[model samples]
Target: CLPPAGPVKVTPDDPRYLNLKLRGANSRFNGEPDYIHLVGSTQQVADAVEETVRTGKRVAVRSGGHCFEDFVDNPDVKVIIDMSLLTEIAYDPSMNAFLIEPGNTLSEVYEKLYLGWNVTIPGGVCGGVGVGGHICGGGYGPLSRQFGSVVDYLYAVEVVVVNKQGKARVIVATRERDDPHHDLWWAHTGGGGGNFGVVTKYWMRVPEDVGRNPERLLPKPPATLLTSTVTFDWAGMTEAAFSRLLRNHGEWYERNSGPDSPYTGLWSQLMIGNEVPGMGESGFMMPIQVDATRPDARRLLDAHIEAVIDGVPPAEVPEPIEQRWLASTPGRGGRGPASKTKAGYLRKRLTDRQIQAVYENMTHMDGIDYGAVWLIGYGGKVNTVDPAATALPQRDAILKVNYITGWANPGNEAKHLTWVRKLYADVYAETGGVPVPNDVSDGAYINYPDSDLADPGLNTSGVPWHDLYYKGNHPRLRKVKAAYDPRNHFHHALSIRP
Candidate 1:
C-alpha cells in the first residue's frame, strides 16, 4: 500500500517542534517555524508545499538536515518540510534507472547500492549528507577521482514545483528528453538545491554510452578499502616549516592530478588543525589520511606521505595508523565533528604569499578552540568532463580547500566565526578577500556554502557571490530559474535568481 498521502504536521506547540528545528549537525541555527511537516511521499511534499504557498508562509525543505548554513533554519522559514522520512531506494524499470528518494543518507544509499547491486554513487566523505542537496550541487568523493561526480551518473530528477495555478505538481525531467522541461533537468545537474524547486527523487544510471547490468550502470566500488593516517607534530614546527609543509602538499597534487595518472586511484585528505580539544595543547598536528582500492594502494599511500614530509625532520613524524573502510560501522564514516566551513578550489599550488598568509593566522591558536585547513585531493576522472557540459565548472581544479572551526558552546560562536572568517579573508586578500576564480583559485564550492561569500562586508570581491559558486554557469542557471521557478518560490541566501 502507498504511504499516507497527507503530511504529518507538527505545529509549534507540539513536543517535536524543537527536535525538528534543531536536527541539523550545526546546532547554532534553528528555525521556529509555525509548522514542521514530516513528509513520506512526493504527493505529501506537494500537499505541504501547496498549503504553505496558500498560507503565504515561507517554506524550507530538510533532508538529513546537514546543511552548512541556516538555509532551512532561519526566522523567515514559516514551514519546514522535513523529507527525512521519505528514504527509499529501488530499481525503477520504467525509468531504466535506480530511483533514490531525497531523504536517503549517503551511508544508507551506499549500503543499499553496494549490497544490492555491488555498485555505488561517487558521493561525499561524510555518511550523514542527504542525496537531495549533495547530488544537486555536484557531489564528489573518494570514487569521484575514479568514476566522476554523482551528477555525472544522474539520468533524471523528479521535482515538486508550484505551478502558475498556485498548485503543487510533480515534474519528471530527464537528460534524454527534448521536452520543454529538459532545462529543468539540467538545472539540477549542478545548479545547487533550494534554487529552482524541491527535488523529490532522482534516477541514476551510467551515461548512455555503456551497455549491461547494474554493475556497468554504476561504478563498481572496491571489494575492500585500505586507509592509512599519518600525523605530524606541530610542536616541532615553526612558521617556515608550516609554509614548507603546506607548499609541499599543494605541489604534489598540482603535479599528479590527471585522468590517467598512476596516482589517480589514490586519494588523501590533509588536515592541518589547531590544538586538540580537551588535550590542553597549544600546538597543531597535521594529519594526512590516504586511501585506495587498487593493488598499489599501500605504495601510493607511502609515496604520498614521503613526498609531503620530504624536507621535514624524521622525528617530527609519528607512527602511521591504518584502517579498513569495509570494516567500519554503517553511517559512521567518521568525517569529523560539526563545524563552520569555507571552501575554495585551487588551480595552482599555494604561493609563498598564500602559504605565509595561512600560517600567520593559523598560529593564532588561542582564537579557535579546534579547527583545520583541510586540503582534499580533487580531479582525476572528474576532470575528464568538460566544465560547460555540466553545472560543476571547475574541471581543471587540482585541490579543494576547506577552512573549518568547531565548538560545542553556542556562546563561543563569535570567536570561531572570527577565526575562520579572518583566515579566509586574509588568505584571499589578493582577490578582494574572496576566491574569485582567478589563475590562483577557481572560486568556491557550492556544496560547501559559506554565507559570508554573499556578504559585502566579508566578500570584498567585486564579483557577486553567485559567480564564485556558479562561475559562468550562472546565466544558464538563471534562465532555468526563470522558466521553472517563474514566481521565485524556492530561494535562499545564495540561491539562483531568475
Candidate 2:
C-alpha cells in the first residue's frame, strides 16, 4: 500500500467524513469538525497542526478513537488531526529504545513486541485501545501486578507542540534528568493525554537495561496462565450474602496487594451487575488468572478463592483452564455502545456503609439493567513507585473500582446516567458526592476520565477535578501545559489548566 504524499484533508462533504466522525467508542458524542486531517508522518502532523492554528480553529487529535468522553468528538472542535496511518514499531539505534507510533492499537503492539523481541509492556487489557492515550495515562493490565506500569518503561517521547508565537514545532523529551525538556517527559508519565501536546511517537526501554539485547530490554510475559471464573446467582442472593461477598473480595486484595506478595502473579475482577431480564441469571462474576509456571500456582489460586468465598454463600467455581500466554491474551474488542464511567482507587477495604450501598444499588429494581460495578485487582508492583516520581499520584491503592452503565437507545441515556450517578454518589456519600483521597479512597484514575467530577452539582466534595485526577501533581502538570502548550490549543473537558 502506498502512503499519501502528505496529510489528506477531509471535509464534511467527503464520503469518508461520516465514518471517521462516528469512530469513537462512545456513540453519544460525534465530532463535526470542519476538516479532518489524516497525517502519516511526524512532519505531516506538524504541518496539519500549524495549519489548524493558523486558521484560528480549535483542534483535537484522534488515534484509536476509544475515548470515553467527548474529548475528540465534540461540537466545539473545528479541526481533527487523525493519526490512524502512523502505525510503526521498530528499534531506533540512535536512542537505544523501541520506537512506537501513537496509531498502533494495544493488540498490534503486543503481537509485534512479543513476536519480534519476546518482550512486552504492562498495558491495558482491551486490545482495541490505542497506545496514544493509554501510555500517557500510565497504562496497566493483567501483567501490571508483576511488572509495574507501561510508563515505568517509557524512555522518551517525540511530540508536536505549539509555541507562544503561534507556530507548531517538534520536541523530543527524554527521562534523562539533565535534558532541557525533561519536565515534558515527566508530565507525560501519567498526566493523561490531550493536555500537553500532540504525541507522534514514544520510545520505550527498561530502565535497568538501556542498550541490552532487544529481548532482554523489556519484561517477558508469563509462558502460561491458569484462568477461571466464580459466579454468584442473583435470584437467591440476600443483602447479607451480597455484603459478605463484597467484603470478602476487598479483604483478600488488602492482604495480598503488596510489592513482594506471593500472590502478585494473580489478577482478577469482581463484576457485580444489575438484574436484567432475559440475560440469563443476572449475577456477579469474578474472572481470575495466575501465571501457571509457578510451582505452587494452583495452590495459591485455590487458597485465594477459598478466602473470598469462605463466609459468603455458596457460589459456583469452575476448574481452572491452562493456556499459553499469548493465546489467553484478548484480541481487539470492537467498539461498544454509548457509556458513562466513574472510577476510583481504593487503598483499603470498603467500609460497611459502602458495602451496603453497593448491595442496594445492585439489587435496585430500576428498569435500567446494563449497569455494573467492577472491583479490579491493582497495586502490586505499581505501588512500589513513589507518588511524586511520576505524574500519576495514586500510588498506595489496592483496588481500582469502576462504576459504569451503557445503553443502546439514546432516549434511555438519561435513565442510565441517573442510575450510575446515584450509585456512585451513594457509595461516596461520606465525602461529598465524589471519591476523595483519604484512608479508604485515594482519588480517581485519569485514564477513566469523568467529566461529572467537574460538575459542582454532582461533585460536592470541594475537591476540584484536577485534584481528584492529578492530586498534588496538578501544579506541575499546569506548569508543563504552560511551557509546552502555552497557547492552550490542545484541550478538552478535563485538560490540565495553565
Candidate 3:
C-alpha cells in the first residue's frame, strides 16, 4: 500500500523500468532515462536532485503524467523523480490547513478530504488528474462557479530545489511567512509547475473566515445535482442553425456571468465533436450539470435550457435527471486516444465571424477522427477575484474553450495537428493566431499547456509565450524564479524563465 522502506533506485535492467518509462498519457513521446527514483520522502527527492545535478543529467518530475505536451517525456531528461509514491493527505494543525502530497489524484484527494473531513477543493473535472501540477496551474471545476479555484485555498508549499552552489535543498514556503521564501509560495499559487522547483507537498486552508472546524473551513458540496443532456444531429444542421446554437449558448453566459448571479450553481460543458456527417455520433451534444440543492434549482436549469434552445429547430431535448452529488465522483471514461489540446478564454459572447470559423473547421474533413471544441461555462464567483490577485490572470473570462483533436494512426498526427492549429489560428485570427488578453479574449490557460504558443511560426501574435499564459504576471513570476531557482534547475518547454 505504501512505497518501499526508502526511496528505490530503478535501473533499465530493473523489472519495472519499461512500465515506468511508458507511464505518460501520450505514448507518442518516450524517453529512456538512465535511472528512475521512486521518491518517498522530501530528503530522497533532494538527494536525487543533487545526484542528477552533480552528474549533469537533466531531471524531470513526474506526478500524474497528464501533461498534453512532452515536457517530462523527452530525450533530454536523464532521470525522473517519480512522486507517485508520495500520496499523503492529512490535517496540519501547525498551519491550520490540510497537507496534501502531489502524488494524489483528484479523485483520491476528493475521496480523502470528503470522507475524512467533509471538505473538498474545487479541482479539475477529471478525477484521474494529479493535484501536483493541477493546483499549481490554478485548477477549477463545476464547484468553482460557486466556490473559487483550487489555488484560492492554497496556503503554502514544500519544494525540493537546487541552490546557487548546486546543492539540493528543501524549503517550506507559505503566504503568511514574512521571509524571502514568501515569493516562492506566491509563484506556486498560479505560476504553473516544473518552473520554480519540484513541489513535494501543498497546504490548503480558507482565508479570513470560519471556525477551526473542518466543515467550516472549505465550501461543502451540494447534497444533490440536476443534470441534463441534449444531442443534435449534425446532418440536419445548416450554417444558420449552428450559428444560432452558438450565439444562444454564449449570450446566456455573458448575461449571467456576474459573481452574484443566481445561476452560479449551474455549470455546463458543450461538446461539439469532430464534424463528419454520417458519423451517427457526430453532432452537438451538451452535458449540463447544476447543484440542485439551491432554491428554485429546477427553475434555473429549465430557464437555462430554454434560453439555449430558443431559436434552434427542436430535436432531441431530454428531461433533466437528478442525482446525488455527495456520493458521486463525476469523471471521464478512460485514458483516451492520442490527443492534443490548446485552451482559450472568452471574455464575452463570441462574434459571428468567430462562430463561422468554428463551423468551418468542425465541418471540414481532416485526417482527424475525434475532433471536438469544448465551450465550458465559467465566471460567477471565480470572477470575483482580481486578475492579479493570484497567479491566474483570466478571472474575468466567462467561458473556457478547448480546441482538441485525437487520432489513432501515428501517420495522421501531422494532419490532426494541422487541423487543430488552423482551427485555433483561424478562430482567433483577429488576435494574431493565438488568444491574447484583449477586449474579447482573456488569453489561455496554463494547465492546458500549448507549446505551439511558444513557437514563433505558430504564434505570430507578437505577444511572447509567457504573456499568453501569465499576461502581466510574468514579471512577478520571473522575479520569484530568479530568487528561488536562479540556476533554473526545474524547467521544461514552457517553464517560467528567470
Candidate 4:
C-alpha cells in the first residue's frame, strides 16, 4: 500500500504498450488497452483497482478477454488488469473444491485437474471459453446435464473489489454458511461478469457431497469426443420433407428433453438453409455430438440418429459422417488481447413456423459473414436448476440460442451486420424483444458479447441488454450493485444497472 507511483511503471504509448488485445472472440470486440498491468498476484490487481478508482478513472478487467459489448470498450479505460496470467488450477480434495484463475479456460481446467488429482468440473463446452465470465453467467455445456453448471460447483471466489471510497480490497467469499458479504457471493453466482467486481480467481466444490457423488457432479473427461454429421441433399425433396425434417428434429428434442430421457448425454442441433453462395435448393445439415463411455457409445448414437431421420429421408440423404476428437478447448495465457462475446437462451422449442422463418431469412442472406447460431438443445439438466439458485433465471429453457455473425469486409459492415442481427432478432423474436421482458423472450446469454444488443445505435432491436440476460433477476442484480458498487465503479452499457 505504501508503494508510490514514482517507482511504478506504466507505458501508454510504447509499441508493446499497445492494446494488450486478446485472441479468439475478444479479438473481434475490443480495440487495444491504453495500458496493460500484468499482475502476478492478487495484491497487484487490488492495487491496480485502487489506483484506477482513486483517480476516478475507468478500468477493464480482462480474463479470457471476451469483452462482450465494451465491458472494457470505454474511451476512459486507463488501466487494464489482464487476468489471463492467473492460470493455476489448484484443487483441495479436503475442501472438495478447486481454485481456478479467471484467465483459465476449460481445456486447462480439464487437463490440470486430471493431472492434479484425476478429477474435473463441468465448465465450458468449446474448450477455449474462459472460466471468469462463463460461470458467472451460468454457463451450460456438454457437462451440464452431468454437472448442472460451472456455478453449481462454485464454492467461492477471491475478488479484488473496488469499494465506494475508490479503494481496492481482496476478499474471499464461499458457499458455506452466511458469507460476510453474502450479496457479493450471490452476485458472482450467475450475476454475469464485470458487474460488481473483478474476480481474479474462483473456487468451486462438488455438489451434495453427503450423498454418493451425484451423476451430475462431474465426469472424467471422456478419452475422446465423438463428432458426427448428417447431411441431406434437399434438391430432390419437397418443402413438406424439409418441414418434416425440422419438425422431426424438434419432436425428438421434445421427447429427449424430458426429465428421464435416455439420450440426455448426447445433445443434437439442426442446420438447414442455403447460406452458402450456391448449394442445394434448400440444403439440410444436422450434427449430433455425444459424451459417453466407449463401448455402447456408437450404438447409442446410431439409435439416437435412427430415431430422428431413420426411414423418413425424403429420398436418399447421405449417411452421417462420424469423427471423434478429445473433448476440450485451449486457453491463451495472457498472450492475446481481450474480446467481446454475446449469448442467449431459449425456452420452448421453435415451432415449424419459426423453422420456416429461419429458412426464409437465410434465403436472402447473400451478404452475411461470420454469423451463426449454435442452437444447443437446452433441457436435460438446464431446466432442472432452481430459479432462485442464481441470477441466471432461465431455468425453464429447452434450448440455448447462440448467435455469431462475423464478416471481415468492413465496407459491407452495414449490409452483413444487418443480416446477422436481423436474422437473430427475427428467428429469436420471442426470446429477444425490446428492452423490457417480452412474452416469448426468456432472456439472452451475456458471454457472446454483442455490442449490437446494447448500443442503441447498433441494436435498434428493442431488447435492452440487461433484460435479455437478467430477466426479473435484473432487480436483484441492481440491488446488489447498490450495496457493493454504489458509485458504479464497475460500469458498462449492459452491465447490471442500479
TM-score leader: 2
Descending-lDDT candidate ranking: 2, 3, 1, 4
Which of 1 and 3 is the better model by lDDT?
3
What candidate 3 gets wrong by more than 4 Å, as runs, is: 1-4, 177-179, 275-283, 326-335
Candidate 2: give the clashing pairs: none
Write the residue-wise lDDT of candidate 1 on 48-152 in tens digits. Answer: 888987888888888877788888988898888898788889888787789999989998899888878888898998787888889998999977877888989
Runs in model 1 lying further than 4 Å from the true structure: 1-6, 277-293, 314-325, 330-338
TM-score of each: 0.94, 0.97, 0.96, 0.84
Tens-digit lDDT track for model 2 on 1-498? 686557789999999888778777778897789988899989999899898789999999888888888999998999888888899998888888899999999999999998888888989888888899999988899888898889988999999999999898899999999999999999989999999889999999888854557777788888888888998888778888888888888999999999999888999999888655655423478888998889899998999898898877658898899888678465544556788988998999899999998888877847675888999899899999989898899889999999988787888999998889999999999999788999999999888999999989899878899999888888889889999899999999999887
Superposed by TM-score, candidate 2 places the C-alpha of residue 312 at a distance from the truth, in angstroms, of 2.2
lDDT of each: 0.81, 0.88, 0.85, 0.64
Q: Give the Å error, residue 440, model 4.
A: 5.5
Q: Could you list the CA RMSD of all candidates, in the order they appear?
A: 2.6, 1.8, 2.2, 4.8
Question: 485, model 1: CA deviation in Å?
Answer: 1.0
Q: Can you rank all candidates by TM-score, best first?
A: 2, 3, 1, 4
- Model 4 Cα lDDT, one tens digit per residue, 1-498: 543222133466655455454443533344445567777677777777787777666777766655456576455566677776677777545544667888787777777776655567766655667787787877777656555667777778887676677777777877766667766777888887877888877877665664433232345555555567776664655566656666666666666775556666686666554445532212356667776555667776777777667556553334544443343344434333221223555555566666676566655667654444445676676566677777777777666665454555456656755675666667656544332233334666666556566677645566577766777777888988887777788776667777
- lDDT, residue 431, model 4: 43
**Candidate 3 lDDT:** 0.85
Model 1: per-residue Cα lDDT at residue 13: 85
